[PDB]
Design a protein around this ligand. Structure first.
Ligand SMILES: CCCCCCCC/C=C\CCCCCCCC(=O)OC[C@H](O)CO
Ligand SMILES: CCCCCCCC/C=C\CCCCCCCC(=O)OC[C@H](O)CO
Ligand SMILES: CCCCCCCC/C=C\CCCCCCCC(=O)OC[C@H](O)CO
Ligand SMILES: CCCCCCCC/C=C\CCCCCCCC(=O)OC[C@H](O)CO
Ligand SMILES: CCCCCCCC/C=C\CCCCCCCC(=O)OC[C@H](O)CO
Ligand SMILES: CCCCCCCC/C=C\CCCCCCCC(=O)OC[C@H](O)CO
Ligand SMILES: CCCCCCCC/C=C\CCCCCCCC(=O)OC[C@H](O)CO
Ligand SMILES: CCCCCCCC/C=C\CCCCCCCC(=O)OC[C@H](O)CO
Ligand SMILES: CCCCCCCC/C=C\CCCCCCCC(=O)OC[C@H](O)CO
Ligand SMILES: CCCCCCCC/C=C\CCCCCCCC(=O)OC[C@H](O)CO
Ligand SMILES: CCCCCCCC/C=C\CCCCCCCC(=O)OC[C@H](O)CO
Ligand SMILES: CCCCCCCC/C=C\CCCCCCCC(=O)OC[C@H](O)CO
Ligand SMILES: CCCCCCCC/C=C\CCCCCCCC(=O)OC[C@H](O)CO
Ligand SMILES: CCCCCCCC/C=C\CCCCCCCC(=O)OC[C@H](O)CO
Ligand SMILES: CCCCCCCC/C=C\CCCCCCCC(=O)OC[C@H](O)CO
Ligand SMILES: CCCCCCCC/C=C\CCCCCCCC(=O)OC[C@H](O)CO
Ligand SMILES: CC1=C(/C=C/C(C)=C/C=C/C(C)=C/C=O)C(C)(C)CCC1
Ligand SMILES: *C/C=C(C)/C=C/C=C(C)/C=C/C1=C(C)CCCC1(C)C
Ligand SMILES: *C/C=C(C)/C=C/C=C(C)/C=C/C1=C(C)CCCC1(C)C
Ligand SMILES: *C/C=C(C)/C=C/C=C(C)/C=C/C1=C(C)CCCC1(C)C
Ligand SMILES: *C/C=C(C)/C=C/C=C(C)/C=C/C1=C(C)CCCC1(C)C
Ligand SMILES: CCCCCCCCCCCCCCCCCCCC
Ligand SMILES: CCCCCCCCCCCCCCCCCCCC
Ligand SMILES: CCCCCCCCCCCCCCCCCCCC
Ligand SMILES: CCCCCCCCCCCCCCCCCCCC
Ligand SMILES: CCCCCCCCCCCCCCCCCCCC
Ligand SMILES: CCCCCCCCCCCCCCCCCCCC
Ligand code: NA
Ligand code: NA
Ligand code: NA
Ligand code: NA
Ligand code: NA
Lengths: 268, 268, 268, 269, 269
C-alpha cells in the first residue's frame, strides 16, 4: 500500500533495480550536485569580470547554485537511503526505513530557481517596449502557479492518473505564458546591441527553450511509452533522473555562463 | 502510549500517522526553508558594498540572521525525517521514538538570535527623531526576550495542558503588542525627513513586518484554530503549521533584509 | 549498571531518565550555542576593516575562538541526542550506551584554545603601563592551562569520588584567582591615558569578564549546589548546567569580543 | 550469491574478503586523495593574484576541478567504508550489501567535469598559432565526452562480460588517442614564441599529461593485468587499482594545475 | 577474535577494554586536534597581508597543511568513537568491529602532504648561502617520502611481528636523521645576513622542529617504551600515544607556521 507515491517506489518495490540502474541514478545525482557547487565557485570568482550594472546577474546565478547543490545533495542521499541490496536476487528493492523516494523536493525548490533564473536576464538585457516591473511580475506569478500546480500533480502520477494529467495541463498553461514573455524579452534585448550580443541572445533563447521543455518531459517520463510500456520500468527511472540532471545543468550553469558572456560583451 | 509534554505532531503521528503527501510536503517545505536561508546569506554578503558604509551594518546583521536561520532549519529538517518512519502494512508514517520526539522549540530558542538582530538592524538605516536609540534598542530586546521565552514555555503544553498553553500564549502576546507599538513608532519617526521613495519603502516594510510577525502566533495556535477535534487537528494541521512557519521565516528575514537594503540604497 | 568515573547526567539518565521538557531543552540550548558561535564567527570576520590595523588582531583572535567554540558545541549537541533515547512505555529518555556516555570534558580541553586566546586578545587593544607584555602573556597562559587541566581531571570524579572532585576544583580555583588578579591589573593599566568612553567600555568588560568566567565553576559545582540528594541532583540540574554553560559561552566569547571591538573603534 | 554487473572489488570482498592491510590502505589512500583535492582548492584560490589577469581563468578552472574531485573522492571514501564490514571469526572484511555495492562509476561521470575543464584551461595560458581556439576546444570536449561515456559503460561488465568490457575499452581508447593527438598539437603550437623556460615547462607538462592520463586505462584493466586467476585478481589488485587512481588524480589535476600556474607566472609581466 | 596486522589499540580494546576516562580523553584530544587545525587555517588565511608579498607563499603553504590536518583529525576522531562501544555489564568500552578496526595509518599517508610542505615553506623565508635551493628541496622531499612510507609499512606489524616493526622503524629513522641534518644546515644558512632578532627566531624554530618531529617516533614506539608487557602496553599507553600525536601535530604545524610568520614579519620592510 504505497498510496500517493512516485512511480520510482513502485518499480523498486515490485521489480527492484539492477546494479546498473541504481548505481547510475546515484552517479547522475552526485554529478548534478558536484556541478552545482563548482558553478557556485565559478560565479563567485568571476564577479569583477563584468561591469557593475551586470554583477547582479552573477550574484543571482550564485544564489541559484546554492539552492540546487543543497537539493541535489539531499535528493542524492535520499535515493541511496530508499533502496537497498537483496543478496538473494542481486537487486535493490525499496527500503521503507529510508522513506519513499519523492521528486517533490525539486518542485518546491524551483520556487527559488524559476523566479531568479527569469529575473537575472533583466539585469543584462535592455527593454524597448515592455516595463521591467510588468515583465518581472508576470514571470514570478506564472512561475509560481506552474510550479505549485505541477507539484500537486506529481503526487498522483500512479494513484490518480486523471489528476496527474489535469494538473499537468493547468501547469503547461502558465508554462506557455512564461515562454511567450521570455521570447518578448529576448527580442527586445536584441535591439541596439552588436551582432555578437545578438548571437549570444539567440543561443540563450534556444538553450532556454530546450532545457526548460525538458522538465515536463521528466514529469511524463514513466508514461511516454504508454501504460505498461518500455519506459514504465527501471529504464524510465534512469531516464527521468538523467533528463533532470541534463536540464538542471543546462538551465542553470550554462544559462548563467552565457548571460555572463553577454554581460562581458556589453561591458565597456 | 505515554508521550508527556510533547507537540501535537507527535500525537497525530502516533495515533493516525501521516500520509505520503503530508510527510513529504513537510520535509520539502523545511528543506526549502533552509535552502532559502543559505542563498540569502550569500546575497547579503555579496551585496555589502552596494550601500554607504554607515548602512553596511544592516547587511552584516542580515547575514548573521541568515546563518542562525539556516542552521536551525537544517537541524529541524533532519529532526522531522528522523521522528517518523514508514509503516508498510498500512502505508503511513508513524512516530519513531528512536529518532526522538518532534519539537518546535528549536525555532523558539533560536529566535533569541533572530528577533533582537532583526529589530536592531532597522536602527542602522532610519534616523530616530524624538525617540532615543538606546531606549528603542533596550525595549526591543527585553520585550523580544520575554515574548520568546514565554511562548517557548507555553508550546510544551499544547496538548498536555491547554490552560497553561493559552495563559503563556497571552502573556507572550502582551510583549508582542509592545514590540508592534515600538516598531510603529520607529517607522513613523524614520519616515520624517526622508525622500518619498524611502517613505514608500518604509510603508512596505511596516506592512510586511505586521503580517509576517503576526503569522507566528498563528502557527502557535494552528492545531486549535478549528476547535477541539476540529479539521486542523490532523496531518493537515501539521502541514499548515510548517507551511506558515516557512512563509513567515522567508518574509520576516530574507524579504525584510532585502527591503532594508533597498531603503539603504535610496538613502545613499 | 556500573558507570564508573562518569558525569552525573549519565546517572540521572540511567536511573530516572529525562522528561520531554528536560531533554528537548538541553538539545535546544546546545543548538542555540553553536548557532551563536557560527554567527559570531561571521560577524567578527565581516567587521575586521572597522578598526585600525593595530587592533585587527583582536578580531582575528575572536574569529579563532569562534571556530573552536562552534565545532565543540556542534559535537556536544550531537552527543547529547545520541546518548539518551526515548522509552515509550514510560515516555522518558534514558541512557543509551551504544551512543557513548555523556561527558562535558570536551569543553575543558577545548578551553585550551579559548582561555589563552581570549586572555591574549585584550593585549592587542589596551596599552600596559608598568606591566610587561610578555610577563602578562606568560602568566595568563600558564595559569589558564593549569586551571583547565586540574578542573578537567576533577570533573571525571564528580560522582565516583567527591573528594578528588572538590580537591581538584580548589586547585583550579587558585589559578582562577591568579588569572582574575592579572586581568584586574591589565584593565586598570589599560584605562590609563584613554578617553572616558573607552574607560566605561573597559569597566563593562571587567564586569562581564568577572561574571561570565565565574559562571564556569558554577556549572562545575551545579549538581551539588543544593547538597547531596538535593533538588539540583536531578534533570533540573542537567538543564541548569547546560543553560549556565551556554550563557557563559555567549557572554565570555561573543559579547566579550564585541565589547573589545567597540573599544578598538573608540581608540581608533 | 548473485552480484550481476558489479565491479570486481565486490566479488573479491564477497568470496575471499579483505585483510586489515588491504582495507585500511584503500581507505587511507582515498582519504589522502580527497584531502589533497581540498588543499589544492585552497592553493589555487589563494594564488589567483600571482599571475596577469588574462591567465587567472586557468586558476579558476583548476579550482573548479578541485571542487568536483574533492566531492567525488569524499563520497567514494565513504562508499568504501560502507561496503565492507569486519568479520571477527576469520579477521577479514567482507562485502556488506546493506551499504550498497562498491562501484568506481562515481569517478567516471565526474570526469565529465574534470576532463573538459582540464583540457580547456591550458587554452588560457598558451597561444595557438595555426589552429583555431574553438575548433581545438570542441574537439577536446567531444572526444573526452565519448571516451568517458564509453569507458563508463564498459566498466560495469569488468566481471560479468569480459567481451563488452574489452570492446568498450577499445572504443574509449580510440577517443583517448585522438585527445592525445590534439594535445600534442596544442603543446607544439604553444611552445612557439615564448621563452625557453616556458618551453621547458611545457615539455614537463606534456610528459606529465601523457603519463598521468595513461594511468587511467591502467586502473581500468588492473584486475586482469596478470591474466585470469592471476596475482592482481586479489585484494592486491584492489589496492593497486585505488593507488593508481589516487596517483593519477593527484598528478593529472593538482600538479598539472601547479605547472600551468608556473608557466603563467613566467609569461606574466 | 583474531585481529591480524592491526594496531595495538584494537588488542587492548578487544581484551581489557577502555575505561570511561581513557575513552573520553582520547576522543577529547582528537577533537581538540581538529579544532586547533581549523582555527589555525582561519588564522593563516586572515594574516596573509601582514608580510611582504615574497613571504606570503609561506602563509599559503601553512593553510594547505591546516586543511589536510583538519580533515584527517576529523576522520580519525570519528573513527575512534566508531570502533569502541560501551558494555553496560562491566562499564568499559570494548572493540566494536562493525565500526572497523582502529588504525593510525590515516595520519601516515596524510603526512605525504604535511611533511614536504612543512619542509618546503621555510625555503620561502630564509635565504640559502652555500646550499642550492633545488638540492635542499629534492633531498627534503625524497627523504620525507621514504621515511613516511617505511614507517607506514612498519606500523601495521606493531603487534603481529615486532621484528619487522623495528626493522622498518630503523630504516625510517635513517631518513629522519638525514632530514634533521639538512634542516640544521638550512637554519644555519638562513641565520646568515639577517638581524639578531631573526636569528633568535630561527634558533627557536630549530629547537621546536627538533623536539616536535622527534615526538613522532616516540608515538611510534609508545606501547613498548616500558618493555614487553610493560605499563605502556595498556589503555594508559593508548592515551599517551594519542596525546603525543596531538602535541606533536600542534607544535610542528601551527606553532611552526606562527614562528615562520614572525620571522617573515621581522624580515619585512
Ligand atoms: C487554467 C488555465 C489558466 C490559463 C492562464 C495562463 C496565462 C497566465 C497568466 C496571465 C496573468 C497576467 C500576469 C498577472 C500580473 C500580476
Ligand atoms: C490545496 C490544493 C489541494 C488539491 C489536492 C487534490 C487535487 C487532486 O485530486 C485528486 C483526488 O482528490 C484524489 O484521487
Ligand atoms: C550538456 C551539459 C549537461 C551534461 C550532463 C550530463 C551527461 C550525462 C550522460 C550520461 C550517459 C550515460 C548513459 C547511460 O548508460 C548506462 C546504461 C548502459 O546500458
Ligand atoms: C498579562 C501579562 C502582561 C505583562 C506585559 C505587559 C506589557 C509589557 C509592555 C512593556 C514592558 C516595558 C519594559 C521596557 C524595557 C526597558 C528596560 C528593561
Ligand atoms: C536574551 C536576548 C537578548 C538581546 C541581547 C542581544 C545582544 C547581541 C550582542 C550585542 C552586544 O553588545 C551590544 C552593543 O553594545 C550595542 O552597540
Ligand atoms: C510577566 C512576567 C512573567 C510570566 C509570569 C506569569 C506566571 C504565569 C503562571 C500561569 C501558569 O499556567 C497555569 C495553568 C494551569 O496550571
Ligand atoms: C519556569 C516555568 C514553570 C513551569 C510551569 C508553567 C506551566 O506548567 C504547566 C502545568 O501547570 C504543570 O503540569
Ligand atoms: C597551590 C596553589 C597555588 C597556585 C596559585 C599561584 C600561581 C602562579 C604563580 C605566579 C607566577 C606566574 C606563573 C608563571 C608565569 O611565568 C611568568 C613569566 O615567565 C614572567 O616573564
Ligand atoms: C595527572 C595524574 C593524576 C592522578 C589522577 C587521580 C587523582 C585522584 C583520583 C582519586 C583516586 O582514584 C579514584 C578511584 C575512584 O574511581
Ligand atoms: C567509434 C570508433 C572511434 C573512431 C575514432 C574517432 C576518434 C576521432 C574522432 C573524430 C575527429 C573529429 C571529431 C571532433 C570534431 C567534431 C566537431 C568539432 O568541431 C571542430 C571544428 C568546429 O569549429
Ligand atoms: C548507450 C546504449 C547502452 C549500451 C548497453 C549495452 C552494452 C553491452 O551489453 C552487454 C551485456 O552483456 C548484454 O546485455
Ligand atoms: C605505480 C605502481 C604501483 C604498484 C602497481 C601494482 C602493479 C600494477 C600492474 C602491473 C604490471 C603487471 C605485470 C604484467 C605482466 C604479467 C604477465 C603474467 O601473466 C599474464
Ligand atoms: C592546546 C594548544 C592550542 C594552540 C593555541 C592555539 C590555536 C590557534 C591557532 C592560531 C594561534 C594564533 C597565535 C597568535 O599569535 C599572535 C602573533 O604573534 C601576532 O603577530
Ligand atoms: C618504496 C616505494 C618507493 C617510493 C617512491 C618514491 C619517493 C620519491 C618522491 C619524489 C621526491 C624526489 C624529488 C621530487 O621531484 C620534484 C621536482 O623537484 C619537481 O621539479
Ligand atoms: C628498502 C629496502 C627494505 C629492506 C628491508 C626490510 C625487510 C624487513 C625484515 C623484517 C622481517 C623479519 C621476518
Ligand atoms: C624509531 C625506531 C627505532 C628502532 C630501534 C631499533 C631496532 C634495532 C634494529 C632491528 C633489531 C630487531 C630486534 C628484534
Ligand atoms: C511545464 C510543466 C512543468 C515545468 C516546469 C519547469 C519548466 C521547471 C523549470 C525548472 C528549472 C529551470 C529549475 C532549475 C512541471 C512543474 C514539471 C509540471 C508539468 C508541466
Ligand atoms: C525570524 C523569526 C521571527 C521574526 C519570529 C517572531 C516571533 C514572534 C512574533 C513570536 C510570537 C509569539 C506570540 C505572539 C504568541 C505565541 C507565542 C509566540 C512565541 C509564537
Ligand atoms: C570560553 C570558555 C571560557 C572563558 C572558560 C573559562 C573557564 C573557567 C573560568 C574555568 C573554571 C574552573 C574553575 C575555577 C573551578 C572548577 C574547574 C573549572 C576548570 C571549571
Ligand atoms: C581527473 C581525471 C582525469 C584526468 C581522467 C582521465 C580519464 C581517462 C584518460 C580515461 C581513460 C579511459 C580509457 C583510455 C580506456 C578505458 C576507459 C577509460 C574511461 C578509463
Ligand atoms: C604534521 C606531521 C609531521 C611533521 C610528521 C612528521 C613525521 C615524522 C617525523 C616521522 C617519523 C618516523 C620515524 C622517525 C621513525 C618511525 C616511523 C615514523 C614514520 C613515525
Ligand atoms: C489534459 C488531459 C485531461 C485528462 C484526460 C485524461 C482522461 C482520463 C484518462 C483515464
Ligand atoms: C524544440 C523544442 C523541443 C525540445 C526537445 C524536447 C524533447 C523532449 C524529450 C523528452 C525526454 C525523452 C527521454 C528519452
Ligand atoms: C615564550 C613562551 C612562554 C610560554 C609561557 C608559559 C606557557 C606554557 C605553559 C604550559 C603549561 C603546561 C602545563 C602542563 C603540565 C602537566 C600537567 C600535569 C597535571 C598537573
Ligand atoms: C640503516 C641504513 C638503511 C638505509 C637508509 C640510509 C639512507 C638514508 C639517508 C639517505 C637519504
Ligand atoms: C618519548 C621520548 C621522546 C622524547 C624526545 C625528546 C627530544 C630529544 C631531542 C632534544
Ligand atoms: C629507543 C629504544 C626503542 C626500542 C624499544 C624496544 C622495546 C623492546 C620490546 C620488548 C622486548
Ligand atoms: Na542503498
Ligand atoms: Na523517516
Ligand atoms: Na536521542
Ligand atoms: Na566498514
Ligand atoms: Na562509541
Amino acid at each position: 500500500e504505497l498510496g500517493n507515491a512516485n512511480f520510482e517506489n513502485f518499480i523498486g518495490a515490485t521489480e527492484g533495480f539492477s546494479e546498473i540502474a541504481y548505481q547510475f541514478t546515484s552517479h547522475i545525482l552526485t554529478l548534478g550536485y558536484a556541478v552545482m557547487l563548482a558553478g557556485l565557485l565559478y560565479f563567485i570568482l568571476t564577479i569583477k569580470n563584468v561591469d557593475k550594472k551586470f554583477q547582479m546577474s552573477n550574484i543571482l546565478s550564485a544564489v541559484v547554485m546554492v539552492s540546487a547543490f543543497l537539493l541535489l545533495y539531499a535528493q542524492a542521499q535520499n535515493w541511496t537511503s530508499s533502496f537497498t541490496f537483496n543478496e538473494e536476487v542481486g537487486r535493490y528493492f525499496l527500503d521503507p526505513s529510508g522513506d519513499l523516494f519523492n521528486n517533490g523536493y525539486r518542485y518546491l525548490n524551483w520556487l527559488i530557481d524559476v523566479p531568479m533564473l527569469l529575473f537575472q536576464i533583466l539585469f543584462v538585457v535592455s527593454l524597448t517596449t515592455s516595463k521591467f516591473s510588468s515583465v518581472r511580475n508576470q514571470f514570478w506569478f506564472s512561475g509560481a502557479m506552474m510550479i505549485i500546480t505541477g507539484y500537486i500533480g506529481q503526487f498522483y502520477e500512479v494513484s490518480n492518473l486523471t489528476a496527474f494529467l489535469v494538473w499537468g495541463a493547468i501547469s503547461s498553461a502558465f508554462f506557455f505564458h512564461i515562454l511567450w514573455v521570455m521570447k518578448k524579452v529576448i527580442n527586445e534585448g536584441k535591439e541596439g546591441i552588436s551582432p555578437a550580443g545578438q548571437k549570444i541572445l539567440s543561443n540563450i533563447w534556444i538553450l532556454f527553450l530546450i532545457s526548460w521543455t525538458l522538465y515536463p518531459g521528466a514529469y511524463l517520463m514513466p508514461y511516454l511509452t504508454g501504460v505498461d510500456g518500455f519506459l514504465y520500468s527501471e529504464d524510465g527511472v534512469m531516464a527521468r533522473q538523467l533528463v533532470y540532471t541534463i536540464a538542471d545543468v543546462s538551465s542553470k550553469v550554462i544559462y548563467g555562463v552565457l548571460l555572463g558572456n553577454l554581460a562581458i560583451t556589453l561591458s565597456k
